[PDB]
Design an enzyme around this catalytic site. Structure first.
Site, PDB file in Angstrom:
ATOM      1  N   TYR A 112      70.934 -16.720  61.692  1.00 51.43           N
ATOM      2  CA  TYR A 112      70.526 -15.394  61.412  1.00 51.43           C
ATOM      3  C   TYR A 112      71.356 -14.253  62.052  1.00 51.43           C
ATOM      4  O   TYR A 112      71.335 -14.189  63.230  1.00 51.43           O
ATOM      5  CB  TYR A 112      68.780 -15.346  61.404  1.00 51.43           C
ATOM      6  CG  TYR A 112      68.638 -13.823  60.964  1.00 51.43           C
ATOM      7  CD1 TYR A 112      68.061 -13.889  59.441  1.00 51.43           C
ATOM      8  CD2 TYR A 112      68.335 -12.684  61.693  1.00 51.43           C
ATOM      9  CE1 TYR A 112      67.805 -12.802  59.067  1.00 51.43           C
ATOM     10  CE2 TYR A 112      67.878 -11.603  61.039  1.00 51.43           C
ATOM     11  CZ  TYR A 112      67.452 -11.575  59.684  1.00 51.43           C
ATOM     12  OH  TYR A 112      66.882 -10.327  59.071  1.00 51.43           O
ATOM     13  N   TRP A 114      73.015 -10.027  61.296  1.00 53.02           N
ATOM     14  CA  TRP A 114      73.743  -8.908  60.383  1.00 53.02           C
ATOM     15  C   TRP A 114      75.290  -8.953  60.310  1.00 53.02           C
ATOM     16  O   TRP A 114      75.710  -8.355  59.449  1.00 53.02           O
ATOM     17  CB  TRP A 114      73.250  -7.518  60.800  1.00 53.02           C
ATOM     18  CG  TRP A 114      71.955  -7.231  59.962  1.00 53.02           C
ATOM     19  CD1 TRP A 114      70.717  -7.913  59.923  1.00 53.02           C
ATOM     20  CD2 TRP A 114      71.698  -6.185  59.028  1.00 53.02           C
ATOM     21  NE1 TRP A 114      69.789  -7.349  59.000  1.00 53.02           N
ATOM     22  CE2 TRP A 114      70.409  -6.444  58.311  1.00 53.02           C
ATOM     23  CE3 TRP A 114      72.623  -5.159  58.608  1.00 53.02           C
ATOM     24  CZ2 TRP A 114      70.133  -5.542  57.465  1.00 53.02           C
ATOM     25  CZ3 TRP A 114      72.280  -4.461  57.314  1.00 53.02           C
ATOM     26  CH2 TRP A 114      70.972  -4.534  56.932  1.00 53.02           C
TER      27      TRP A 114
HETATM   28  N1  LIG Z   1      69.908   2.978  62.863  1.00 54.65           N
HETATM   29  C1  LIG Z   1      69.384   1.751  62.656  1.00 54.65           C
HETATM   30  N2  LIG Z   1      69.042   1.538  61.200  1.00 54.65           N
HETATM   31  C2  LIG Z   1      68.439   0.292  60.968  1.00 54.65           C
HETATM   32  C3  LIG Z   1      68.343  -0.907  61.605  1.00 54.65           C
HETATM   33  C4  LIG Z   1      68.745  -0.700  63.208  1.00 54.65           C
HETATM   34  O1  LIG Z   1      68.803  -1.614  64.070  1.00 54.65           O
HETATM   35  N3  LIG Z   1      69.446   0.530  63.585  1.00 54.65           N
HETATM   36  N4  LIG Z   1      68.010  -2.064  61.496  1.00 54.65           N
HETATM   37  C5  LIG Z   1      67.888  -2.205  59.868  1.00 54.65           C
HETATM   38  C6  LIG Z   1      67.042  -3.446  59.488  1.00 54.65           C
HETATM   39  S1  LIG Z   1      67.839  -5.105  59.662  1.00 54.65           S
HETATM   40  C7  LIG Z   1      65.818  -3.188  59.122  1.00 54.65           C
HETATM   41  S2  LIG Z   1      64.838  -4.851  58.781  1.00 54.65           S
HETATM   42  C8  LIG Z   1      65.163  -2.062  58.880  1.00 54.65           C
HETATM   43  C9  LIG Z   1      63.686  -2.054  59.601  1.00 54.65           C
HETATM   44  O2  LIG Z   1      63.181  -1.031  58.934  1.00 54.65           O
HETATM   45  P1  LIG Z   1      61.710  -0.592  59.551  1.00 54.65           P
HETATM   46  O3  LIG Z   1      61.072  -2.030  59.637  1.00 54.65           O
HETATM   47  O4  LIG Z   1      60.773   0.172  58.517  1.00 54.65           O
HETATM   48  O5  LIG Z   1      61.878   0.023  60.967  1.00 54.65           O
HETATM   49  P2  LIG Z   1      61.265  -0.192  62.485  1.00 54.65           P
HETATM   50  O6  LIG Z   1      61.790   0.938  63.282  1.00 54.65           O
HETATM   51  O7  LIG Z   1      60.760  -1.534  62.846  1.00 54.65           O
HETATM   52  O8  LIG Z   1      59.736   0.416  61.898  1.00 54.65           O
HETATM   53  C10 LIG Z   1      59.645   1.867  61.426  1.00 54.65           C
HETATM   54  C11 LIG Z   1      58.417   2.721  61.994  1.00 54.65           C
HETATM   55  O9  LIG Z   1      57.358   1.849  61.738  1.00 54.65           O
HETATM   56  C12 LIG Z   1      56.675   1.997  63.135  1.00 54.65           C
HETATM   57  N5  LIG Z   1      55.619   1.179  63.318  1.00 54.65           N
HETATM   58  C13 LIG Z   1      56.026   0.130  64.100  1.00 54.65           C
HETATM   59  N6  LIG Z   1      54.812  -0.670  63.869  1.00 54.65           N
HETATM   60  C14 LIG Z   1      53.792  -0.012  63.281  1.00 54.65           C
HETATM   61  C15 LIG Z   1      52.471  -0.089  62.981  1.00 54.65           C
HETATM   62  O10 LIG Z   1      51.712  -1.102  63.185  1.00 54.65           O
HETATM   63  N7  LIG Z   1      51.647   0.845  62.139  1.00 54.65           N
HETATM   64  C16 LIG Z   1      52.359   2.069  61.912  1.00 54.65           C
HETATM   65  N8  LIG Z   1      51.900   3.121  61.222  1.00 54.65           N
HETATM   66  N9  LIG Z   1      53.959   2.263  62.269  1.00 54.65           N
HETATM   67  C17 LIG Z   1      54.496   1.030  63.186  1.00 54.65           C
HETATM   68  C18 LIG Z   1      57.821   2.300  63.897  1.00 54.65           C
HETATM   69  O11 LIG Z   1      57.034   3.128  65.346  1.00 54.65           O
HETATM   70  C19 LIG Z   1      58.792   2.633  63.573  1.00 54.65           C
HETATM   71  O12 LIG Z   1      59.081   4.306  63.354  1.00 54.65           O
HETATM   72  O13 LIG Z   1      66.015  -0.852  59.547  1.00 54.65           O
HETATM   73  C20 LIG Z   1      67.592  -0.803  59.149  1.00 54.65           C
HETATM   74  N10 LIG Z   1      67.853   0.079  59.360  1.00 54.65           N
HETATM   75  N1  LIG Z   2      60.891  -6.762  69.036  1.00 59.89           N
HETATM   76  C1  LIG Z   2      61.541  -6.698  67.927  1.00 59.89           C
HETATM   77  N2  LIG Z   2      62.595  -7.689  67.603  1.00 59.89           N
HETATM   78  C2  LIG Z   2      63.288  -7.671  66.231  1.00 59.89           C
HETATM   79  C3  LIG Z   2      63.151  -6.407  65.398  1.00 59.89           C
HETATM   80  C4  LIG Z   2      62.125  -5.486  65.646  1.00 59.89           C
HETATM   81  O1  LIG Z   2      61.790  -4.514  64.877  1.00 59.89           O
HETATM   82  N3  LIG Z   2      61.486  -5.701  66.895  1.00 59.89           N
HETATM   83  N4  LIG Z   2      63.874  -6.481  64.176  1.00 59.89           N
HETATM   84  C5  LIG Z   2      64.205  -7.936  63.607  1.00 59.89           C
HETATM   85  C6  LIG Z   2      65.131  -7.709  62.657  1.00 59.89           C
HETATM   86  S1  LIG Z   2      64.499  -6.796  61.084  1.00 59.89           S
HETATM   87  C7  LIG Z   2      66.529  -8.269  62.781  1.00 59.89           C
HETATM   88  S2  LIG Z   2      67.386  -7.942  61.201  1.00 59.89           S
HETATM   89  C8  LIG Z   2      66.954  -8.811  63.812  1.00 59.89           C
HETATM   90  C9  LIG Z   2      68.348  -8.254  64.241  1.00 59.89           C
HETATM   91  O2  LIG Z   2      69.140  -9.489  64.723  1.00 59.89           O
HETATM   92  P1  LIG Z   2      70.758  -9.420  64.524  1.00 59.89           P
HETATM   93  O3  LIG Z   2      71.207  -9.477  63.145  1.00 59.89           O
HETATM   94  O4  LIG Z   2      70.913 -10.750  65.401  1.00 59.89           O
HETATM   95  O5  LIG Z   2      71.321  -8.234  65.685  1.00 59.89           O
HETATM   96  P2  LIG Z   2      72.776  -7.617  65.503  1.00 59.89           P
HETATM   97  O6  LIG Z   2      72.705  -7.006  66.837  1.00 59.89           O
HETATM   98  O7  LIG Z   2      73.163  -6.845  64.204  1.00 59.89           O
HETATM   99  O8  LIG Z   2      73.493  -9.100  65.943  1.00 59.89           O
HETATM  100  C10 LIG Z   2      74.943  -9.241  64.943  1.00 59.89           C
HETATM  101  C11 LIG Z   2      75.855  -9.898  65.708  1.00 59.89           C
HETATM  102  O9  LIG Z   2      77.106 -10.215  64.913  1.00 59.89           O
HETATM  103  C12 LIG Z   2      78.208  -9.890  65.465  1.00 59.89           C
HETATM  104  N5  LIG Z   2      79.300  -9.916  64.870  1.00 59.89           N
HETATM  105  C13 LIG Z   2      79.690  -8.643  64.093  1.00 59.89           C
HETATM  106  N6  LIG Z   2      80.412  -8.922  62.994  1.00 59.89           N
HETATM  107  C14 LIG Z   2      81.014 -10.107  63.160  1.00 59.89           C
HETATM  108  C15 LIG Z   2      81.931 -11.225  62.654  1.00 59.89           C
HETATM  109  O10 LIG Z   2      82.662 -10.497  61.763  1.00 59.89           O
HETATM  110  N7  LIG Z   2      82.197 -12.258  63.371  1.00 59.89           N
HETATM  111  C16 LIG Z   2      81.247 -12.899  64.262  1.00 59.89           C
HETATM  112  N8  LIG Z   2      81.504 -14.154  64.718  1.00 59.89           N
HETATM  113  N9  LIG Z   2      80.033 -12.094  64.788  1.00 59.89           N
HETATM  114  C17 LIG Z   2      80.067 -10.761  64.317  1.00 59.89           C
HETATM  115  C18 LIG Z   2      77.918  -8.718  66.443  1.00 59.89           C
HETATM  116  O11 LIG Z   2      78.569  -9.018  67.558  1.00 59.89           O
HETATM  117  C19 LIG Z   2      76.557  -8.923  66.952  1.00 59.89           C
HETATM  118  O12 LIG Z   2      76.182  -9.692  68.236  1.00 59.89           O
HETATM  119  O13 LIG Z   2      66.298  -8.450  65.092  1.00 59.89           O
HETATM  120  C20 LIG Z   2      65.009  -8.752  64.804  1.00 59.89           C
HETATM  121  N10 LIG Z   2      64.210  -8.617  66.087  1.00 59.89           N
HETATM  122 MO   LIG Z   3      66.165  -6.665  59.537  1.00 59.32          MO
HETATM  123  O   LIG Z   4      67.357  -8.086  58.053  1.00 57.32           O
END
Ligand SMILES: Nc1nc2c(c(=O)[nH]1)N[C@H]1C(S)=C(S)[C@@H](COP(=O)(O)OP(=O)(O)OC[C@H]3O[C@@H](n4cnc5c(=O)[nH]c(N)nc54)[C@H](O)[C@@H]3O)O[C@H]1N2
Ligand SMILES: Nc1nc2c(c(=O)[nH]1)N[C@H]1C(S)=C(S)[C@@H](COP(=O)(O)OP(=O)(O)OC[C@H]3O[C@@H](n4cnc5c(=O)[nH]c(N)nc54)[C@H](O)[C@@H]3O)O[C@H]1N2
Ligand SMILES: [Mo]
Ligand SMILES: [O]
Ligand SMILES: [Cl-]
Length: 763
Positions: A112, A114
């Protein structure tokens, strides 16, 4: 006067890269955005960082006894530089051993993450393509983004819902009086897209703000969105939104503001739910006063939200943080139930949407074509993916999942390519133990991430800037084809993942199946031509690939009037007897007999409030504060942590933790101090950001900081603190945001963060 810019792309948009004498000297947006996106500015740092993996490396102890080593040395061994030939032979031999002795059910390659955008150089897909060409592998179910919502929404609406196009933003601008950002931070989270952000979602939020209409943010933190749009902040305790929604719903009934006609015609089970709402079942009416005690929102404010939502055309925009927690299924189920009671589903500007915060949902769909992408195709063993630690530790264990029983497989080899589980997975210290179980752990990585540091074999991968590819402006508008032209040659000894897997495929005798006999540019032309043919059928002329590629510019499409006017659930609203939902009743399932019949203790037949093990309402003397772990503004998860963007948020060289002034004063903590945060699972250092922008009693630590263990993380990786448990037996999603902690001031000299340096090698 030379044109020295190469156009390429990332999850954070189309990028113009200036090259001077073969060196990258500037990067920024190829298309001007409404708000600056600093993620676009660090291509040079990505290319030239001393955190990059420079050459193939193998753990000293693994080289000595491959597949039979002391695996407790993972994460703390010396590294040996080897040749590509030696590393690839070792990977092939170690995977062949597992295939011969255990078969495909002994290899985990869910992998898993991104990674980077791109139709061809999709590292995770290329790994799975190789694994499938050599016999198969164990993968996973779901994702970390919507692990809960994506399982309950099919039962409630008959569709996944979270990854589907939303009511047109033009309809919102014209017809919505109120938008409610519920657990949603779009000015942070739409800086990226799964393909490449079209940058228009943030532009639409800005336009809505500039129109003067009401924006309400319901969140434990006053988020970047709330600040930048000067929205109305409703502080709420993390994990208490279901009580808040119940109190609103109860007020609607008490004031005759719910839509009884809508509920009868378009929903199933409302009357059974109303008995719960009114306390007829359990003796406890779910009043605004009952809710205020749990969620921290004053009763009169709850009642005023209810009146305003019903009096005005209101769009409920549900983000996903609130379902990334124990009982997470309940939050969007109850949000859809609330929207049903308001009765505006299927009307211009009204109802709900579960992707307005993600990848530019709602930007009108353009008329054109969509490019192809590489596939993994040249299981009873698959599990909800956040059980990974549990699986690696406990083969044969059985769990319940969405009405079925799953048996964990027995994993001997793990291959990750494009994700960072030692940052993304909950309860990092337990994941360390889990990763001692496999015979072999292989990682393809750009950088020396915490996951790479836990492997046996680390193979250096290129960035997007070292290869050629294609992506789309996304994720819903599909409004452009973005070229990803190579900027510089591969750095150090890095290889494209595609080339790594070609070499492994050759050693296994399946290179021709893997490559299909195509060069890089032949693959890209095949992918482009899928869009070309689809566009032609839509009566849109496109250049052929050769001309598009030479021009090296975004190719843009336009949205027509139908897309600009599209209303989600409009056809259902018009005639639900002929446009029914794909549910047992053909309607919105407020009560789901299918879910009821599963007889799960932690997910009932209608939305309900169930207290989680850890949240603001059951903090203790030992752990008196609640934790939330939102997504970061200046990273994509862990990506770009090693770049100069760190200076825009690091506090005393640590990840910042938001702390309310009264909680800080009680501990003698001043803004800028290093603090220690600890839970039953672990401890981290962080830098205090003392602010009224977090609700009292709660602290916020953004996910994604690189784990840097001493166990104590020196850098502030939030998942050292979190619980690793399923949301419920329905979805078994990940549950980080239900967590309690203690904080204390860190006394004395603080340790240097070392996780961005080259690792320990042999002398
Ligand atoms: N810049 C940036 N953009 C991203 C990402 C990133 O890492 N960096 N991750 C991308 C990815 S993979 C995803 S999955 C999405 C995630 O999109 P979201 O899941 O919506 O992002 P979060 O920041 O986890 O949560 C959004 C808001 O919900 C709040 N929140 C958390 N828990 C609760 C709760 O129980 N109740 C309420 N009312 N609010 C709560 C957080 O404080 C936060 O401000 O964003 C994507 N966009
Ligand atoms: N406590 C908490 N935990 C969370 C979340 C939260 O809201 N709260 N959000 C969860 C969610 S929604 C997500 S999506 C996950 C995100 O978890 P990840 O998707 O694992 O986070 P990334 O930092 O985007 O890791 C991407 C990796 O891919 C590498 N990479 C990028 N391009 C390439 C390529 O071309 N080749 C190779 N071999 N590597 C590459 C980067 O160097 C990087 O280490 O985190 C999750 N964990
Ligand atoms: Mo995500
Ligand atoms: O994701
Ligand atoms: Cl209308």
């Amino acid at each position: 006067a030379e044109m020295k810019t190469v156009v390429t792309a990332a999850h954070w948009g189309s990028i113009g890269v200036v090259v001077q004498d073969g060196k990258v000297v500037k990067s920024g947006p190829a298309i001007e955005p409404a708000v600056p996106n600093e993620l676009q500015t660090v291509v040079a740092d990505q290319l030239y960082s001393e955190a990059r993996v420079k050459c193939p490396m193998v753990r000293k102890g693994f080289l000595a006894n491959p597949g039979k080593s002391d695996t407790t040395m993972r994460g703390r061994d010396e590294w040996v530089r080897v040749s590509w030939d030696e590393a690839l032979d070792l990977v092939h031999n170690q995977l062949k051993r597992v295939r011969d002795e255990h078969g495909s059910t002994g290899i985990f390659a869910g992998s898993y993450g991104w990674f980077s955008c791109g139709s061809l150089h999709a590292s995770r897909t290329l790994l799975q393509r190789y694994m499938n060409a050599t016999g198969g592998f164990v993968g996973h179910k779901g994702d970390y983004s919507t692990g809960a919502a994506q399982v309950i929404m099919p039962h409630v609406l008959g569709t996944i819902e979270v990854y589907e196009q939303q009511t047109s933003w033009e309809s919102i601008l014209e017809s919505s009086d109120i938008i409610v950002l519920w657990s949603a931070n779009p000015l942070t989270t739409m800086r990226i897209a799964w393909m490449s952000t079209d940058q228009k979602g943030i532009e639409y939020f800005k336009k809505f703000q500039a129109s003067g209409k009401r924006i309400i943010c319901i969140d434990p933190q006053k988020s970047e969105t709330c600040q930048m749009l000067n929205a109305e902040w409703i502080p709420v305790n993390t994990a208490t939104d279901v009580p808040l929604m119940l109190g609103i719903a109860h007020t609607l009934v008490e004031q005759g503001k719910h839509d009884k006609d809508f509920l009868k015609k378009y929903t199933s089970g409302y009357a059974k739910f109303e008995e719960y709402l009114l306390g007829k079942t359990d003796g406890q009416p779910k009043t605004a006063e009952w809710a205020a005690k749990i969620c921290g929102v004053p009763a009169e404010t709850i009642k005023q939200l209810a009146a305003d939502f019903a009096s005005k055309r209101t769009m409920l925009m549900g983000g996903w943080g609130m379902q990334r927690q124990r009982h997470g299924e309940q939050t969007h189920w109850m949000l859809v139930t609330l929207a049903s009671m308001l009765g505006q589903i299927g009307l211009p500007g009204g109802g709900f949407g579960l992707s307005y915060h993600y990848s530019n949902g709602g930007v009108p769909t353009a008329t054109g074509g969509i490019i192809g992408s590489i596939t993994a195709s040249p299981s009873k063993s698959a599990f909800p993916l956040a059980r990974i630690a549990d699986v690696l530790l406990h083969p044969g264990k059985k769990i319940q999942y969405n009405g079925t029983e799953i048996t964990y497989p027995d994993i001997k080899a793990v291959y990750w390519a494009g994700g960072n589980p030692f940052v993304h997975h909950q309860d990092t210290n337990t994941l360390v133990k889990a990763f001692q179980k496999p015979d072999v752990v292989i990682v393809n990585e750009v950088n020396w991430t915490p996951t790479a540091r836990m492997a046996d074999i680390v193979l250096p991968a290129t960035t997007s800037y070292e290869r050629n590819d294609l992506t789309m402006a996304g994720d819903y508008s599909m409004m452009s084809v973005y070229p990803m032209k190579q900027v510089v040659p591969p750095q150090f000894e890095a290889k494209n993942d595609y080339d790594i897997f070609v070499e492994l495929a050759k050693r296994a005798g399946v290179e021709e199946q893997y490559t299909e006999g195509k060069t890089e540019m032949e693959w890209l032309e095949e992918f482009y031509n899928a869009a070309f043919s689809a566009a032609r059928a839509n009566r849109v002329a496109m250049p052929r690939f050769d001309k598009f590629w030479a021009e090296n510019k975004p190719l843009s499409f336009e949205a027509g009037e139908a897309a600009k006017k599209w209303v989600r659930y409009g056809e259902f609203r018009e005639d639900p007897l002929l446009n029914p939902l794909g549910t047992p009743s053909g309607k919105i399932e407020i009560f789901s007999d299918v879910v009821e019949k599963m007889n799960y203790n932690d997910c009932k037949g209608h939305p309900s409030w169930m207290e989680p093990e850890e949240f603001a309402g059951n903090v203790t003397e030992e752990y008196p504060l609640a934790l939330v772990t939102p997504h970061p503004y200046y990273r994509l998860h862990s990506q770009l942590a090693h770049t100069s963007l760190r200076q825009k948020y690091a506090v005393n060289d640590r990840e910042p933790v938001m702390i309310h002034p009264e909680d800080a004063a009680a501990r003698g903590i001043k803004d800028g101090d290093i603090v220690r945060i600890h839970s039953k699972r672990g401890q981290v250092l962080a830098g205090a950001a003392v602010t009224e922008n977090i609700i009292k009693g709660t602290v916020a630590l953004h996910e994604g900081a690189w784990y840097d263990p001493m166990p104590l993380c020196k850098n502030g990786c939030a998942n050292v603190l979190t619980r690793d448990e399923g949301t419920s037996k329905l979805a078994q999603g990940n549950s980080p945001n239900t967590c309690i902690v203690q904080i204390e001031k860190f006394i004395g000299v603080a340790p240097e963060v070392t996780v961005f340096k080259q690792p320990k090698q042999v002398a």
